[PDB]
């Protein structure tokens, strides 16, 4: 239902958008959120859904809020409030100054040097998975590639057994797109329940995997605590299991639907990195937020201490003020403006790993399976939440149009 309108919010700003089930979802999830950028819609709106909260609807306000951590705090970043309050991942639930000291440690485990360590194996797993599918003439992309490719790279990096994936994937998805069986707090505690013994084991007997590195790490020259390590590792699991996994499906759905765009990349594969950036803009997927630390007037709107404000990345990338014809995918787009990896002091530390997985996937897929389509008659369903995704993506192709490398 709809939470009662707080007295400080005027009626003309009320737009009852539901981030977990947006009314226009059947048009595509990005399209559903873009209803907030129609002609009659102010830059900042109040929804009475999900307990009641603000939504910033334009890149300019989104970027400003991200930059101003004094007024807009990461301490309670997720909607609904109970989820934001429970959320205590590091460094995401912290503001500067305390946040910063934890970035260097996370960078040690998912940053560029690690992407270098994993380079060959990333390449090898993409090729092996795609070659196994190639002669089939069909696949269920979400389960056959989008999930196993990034997830198996992550489990390798984290030194976790692949047999644990179904359990961990289920729990991660309850934090972002809950089925209703578990509250955010329950799902998070279950992920903690998994990590707690593994962290203790690896503090006793360190390995070289990401969990060992975090758990034995130093934070500005002092030892990390067991609790801090757990809160960092929780975030890493969500990053590994529910980010690139969804993004790959949005991208492949688009490419399946656009022979012209496939052809551009088939003919000029050196454009794949630029294509990756334009796809990251167009198929952005995270709805991050903040909590007001004081009463504050922002863009003519009175915000009250404790109000939550959603800062959806879809709305920066799809903002026509920032990107002309924003629903069009243009691989030659000149100035690709987006906040898909965040903005300000919390810029995604996994972004280098993410881009490598995306770029490798596009290159290695189009090399082997240049010509593919959505299964005839299929209707692709999206799902919305803290991270949006694609429920299923049945693809088909003629094996005679494929090439084994
Ligand atoms: C397993 C590592 C990993 C991977 C694969 C990702 N991330 Fe990233 N991320 C993102 C946002 C909006 C923010 C504030 C972060 C912050 C993060 C932070 C916290 C940065 C901070 O709060 O200081 C971490 C550790 C992080 N992200 C690890 C991470 C979005 C993404 C997106 C769109 C992708 C992929 C398409 C992504 N993350 C992959
Ligand atoms: C907001 C994120 C994308 C970032 C990594 C996974 C995620 C949902 C988090 O809890 C932090
Ligand atoms: K919190």
In this structure, which long-range contacts are made by residues 295-302, counting pairs with CB atoms below 8 Å and at least 24 apart in sequence?
296/71, 298/44, 298/61, 298/64, 298/65, 298/71, 299/43, 299/44, 299/61, 301/13, 301/44, 301/54, 302/8
Q: Is residue 217 within 8 Å of residue 229, measured between CB atoms?
A: yes
Q: Is residue 285 within 8 Å of residue 387, measured between CB atoms?
A: yes
Alpha-helix residue ranges (DSSP H) falling in 5-139: 29-33, 59-67, 81-86, 100-110, 112-133
Binding site membership of 77 for ligand 1 (Cβ less than 6 Å): no
Q: How far is CA 367 from CA 238, 259, 272, 405, in A?
A: 30, 15, 12, 8
d(CA 263, CA 245): 24
Q: Is 105 helix (H, G, I), strand (E, B) or coil?
A: helix
Buried b (16+ CB within 10 A) or exposed e, 247-278: bbbbbbbbbbeeeebbebbeeeeeebebbbbb
Q: Is residue 392 within 8 Å of residue 145, measured between CB atoms?
A: no
**Is the preceding peptide bond at 80 cis, omega within 30 degrees of 0?**
yes
How far does the centroid of ligand 3 lie from the alpha carbon of residue 147, in Å? 28
Encoded tokens for 242: 């529910």
d(CA 68, CA 33): 24
Binding site membership of 210 for ligand 1 (Cβ less than 6 Å): no
Report the 10 Å Cβ neighbour count for 384. Answer: 22
d(CA 39, CA 22): 18
d(CA 207, CA 187): 27
- The neighbourhood of ligand 3, an ion, using CB within 5 A, equals 76, 87
d(CA 142, CA 301): 41
Q: Is residue 254 within 8 Å of residue 261, measured between CB atoms?
A: yes
Backbone torsions φ then ψ of 81, nearest 5 degrees: -45, -40
- Method of determination? X-ray
Report the 10 Å Cβ neighbour count for 321. Answer: 13
d(CA 354, CA 280): 10
Encoded tokens for 214: 């975090």
d(CA 333, CA 324): 9
- Rounded to the nearest angstrom, the gap between the alpha carbon of residue 96 and the centroid of all alpha carbons in its chain is 22
d(CA 102, CA 240): 18
Domains and CATH numbers, the chain: 1-405 (1.10.630.10)
Q: Is residue 399 within 8 Å of residue 44, measured between CB atoms?
A: no
Backbone torsions φ then ψ of 111, nearest 5 degrees: -75, -175
Place of tokens 């492949």: 252
Place of tokens 């389960």: 143
Q: Is 156 helix (H, G, I), strand (E, B) or coil?
A: helix
Residue 203 has what DSSP assignment? H
Looking from the CA of residue 350, the nearest atom of ligand 2 is 5
Q: Is residue 54 within 8 Å of residue 307, measured between CB atoms?
A: yes
**Which of 382, 334, 320 lies closest to 34, judged by CA?**
320
Packing angle between helix 272-282 and helix 351-368, nearest 10 degrees? 120
Q: Is 374 helix (H, G, I), strand (E, B) or coil?
A: strand
Q: What is the resolution of this structure in A?
A: 1.8
Binding site membership of 286 for ligand 1 (Cβ less than 6 Å): yes
Q: Is 214 helix (H, G, I), strand (E, B) or coil?
A: helix
Longest Cα separation, the chain: 65
Q: How far is CA 371 from CA 178, 250, 333, 402, 403, in A?
A: 35, 17, 24, 8, 11
Place of tokens 């404000």: 309
Backbone torsions φ then ψ of 226, nearest 5 degrees: -60, -40
Residue 346 has what DSSP assignment? G
Backbone torsions φ then ψ of 44, nearest 5 degrees: -140, 120
Place of tokens 């699991």: 237
Does the annotation list 276 as a binding residue?
no
Name the CA radius of gyration of the chain, rounded.
21
Pocket of ligand 2 (CB under 6 A): 89, 92, 176, 235, 238-239, 243, 286, 288, 386-387
**Which of 316, 339, 389 lies closest to 34, judged by CA?**
316
Which sequence positions are flagged as catalytic? 177, 242-243, 348-350
Q: Is 383 helix (H, G, I), strand (E, B) or coil?
A: strand
**Is the preceding peptide bond at 350 cis, omega within 30 degrees of 0?**
no
d(CA 215, CA 48): 41
């Amino acid at each position: 239902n709809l939470a009662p309108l707080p007295p400080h919010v005027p009626e003309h700003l009320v737009f009852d958008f539901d981030m977990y089930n947006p009314s226009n979802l059947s048009a595509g999830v990005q399209e559903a959120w873009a209803v907030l950028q129609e002609s009659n819609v102010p830059d900042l709106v109040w929804t009475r859904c999900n307990g009641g909260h603000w939504i910033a609807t334009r890149g300019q306000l989104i970027r400003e809020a991200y930059e101003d951590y004094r007024h807009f705090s990461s301490e309670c970043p997720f909607i609904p409030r109970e989820a934001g309050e429970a959320y205590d991942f590091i460094p995401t639930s912290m503001d500067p100054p305390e946040q910063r000291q934890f970035r260097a440690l996370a960078n040690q485990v998912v940053g560029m040097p690690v992407v270098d360590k994993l380079e060959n194996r990333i390449q090898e797993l993409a090729c092996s998975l795609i070659e196994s599918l190639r002669p089939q003439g069909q696949c269920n992309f979400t389960e056959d590639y989008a999930e196993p490719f990034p997830i198996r790279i992550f489990m390798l990096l984290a030194g976790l057994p692949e047999e644990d994936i179904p359990h961990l994937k289920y729990l991660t998805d309850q934090m972002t797109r809950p089925d209703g069986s578990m509250t955010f707090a329950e799902a998070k505690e279950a992920l903690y329940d998994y990590l707690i013994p593994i962290i203790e084991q690896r503090r006793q007997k360190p390995g070289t995997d990401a969990i060992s590195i975090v758990a034995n790490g130093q934070v500005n020259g002092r030892p990390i605590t067991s609790d801090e390590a757990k809160r960092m590792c929780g975030l890493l699991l969500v990053g590994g299991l529910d980010t690139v996994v969804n993004f790959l499906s949005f991208s492949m759905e688009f490419l399946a639907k656009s022979p012209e765009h496939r052809q551009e990349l088939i003919e000029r594969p050196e454009r794949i990195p630029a294509a990756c950036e334009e796809l990251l803009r167009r198929f952005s997927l995270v709805a991050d937020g903040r909590i007001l630390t004081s009463d504050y007037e922002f863009h003519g709107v009175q915000l009250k201490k404790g109000d939550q404000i959603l800062l959806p990345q879809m709305l920066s990338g799809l903002d026509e003020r920032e990107n002309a014809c924003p629903m069009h995918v243009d691989f030659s787009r000149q100035k690709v403006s987006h906040t898909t990896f965040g903005h300000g002091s919390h810029l995604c530390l996994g972004q280098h790993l993410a881009r490598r997985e995306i770029i490798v996937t596009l290159k290695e897929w189009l090399t082997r399976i240049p010509d593919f389509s959505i299964a005839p008659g299929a209707q692709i369903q999206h799902k919305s939440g803290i991270v949006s995704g694609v429920q299923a993506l049945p693809l088909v192709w003629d094996p005679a149009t494929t090439k084994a490398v």
